[PDB]
Structure 1
Amino acid sequence: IARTFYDGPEKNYEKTMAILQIEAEKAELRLKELEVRRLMRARGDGPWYQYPTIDKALIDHSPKTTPDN
């Protein structure tokens, strides 16, 4: 029965090791992403949560019929 239907314990052991490594890395990445989201939304100094401002290319830099703009 063992020879026909089942493998040795090492296969399940090392597959468990691989699964545990993947899951632990995913958990750490989730916590890191939450912290990064919090910091980026608080400071606004990252790529995320960038809200539009007025384009400076819309300004007319011409004499304006009055010396003081």
Structure 2
Amino acid sequence: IARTFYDGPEKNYEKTMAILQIEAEKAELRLKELEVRRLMRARGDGPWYQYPTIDKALIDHSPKTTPDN
């Protein structure tokens, strides 16, 4: 029965190790991702949460009938 239907304990042992490594890395990635989102939303210095401002190319830099702009 063991020879025909099953494998040795090493396969399950090392598959468990691989699965555990993947799961732990995903957990730490999720925690880091939440922290990064919080910091970016608080400070606004990252690529995320970049809310639009007025484009400066719309300004007209020509004389304006009056010296004082």
TM-score normalised per structure 1: 1.00
Structure 1 runs (4+) greater than 3 angstroms displaced: none
- Distance in 2 between residues matched to 1:28 and 1:11, nearest whole Å: 26
Structure 2 segments unaligned to the other structure (5+ residues) = none
Aligned length: 69
Offset of 1:57 from its aligned partner?
0.1
Offset of 1:65 from its aligned partner?
0.3
- Distance in 2 between residues matched to 1:55 and 1:17, nearest whole Å: 53
CA RMSD of aligned residues (A): 0.2
Structure 1 segments unaligned to the other structure (5+ residues) = none
TM-score normalised per structure 2: 1.00
In the alignment, which residue of structure 1 is the partner of 2:67?
A: 67
Identity over aligned pairs, percent: 100
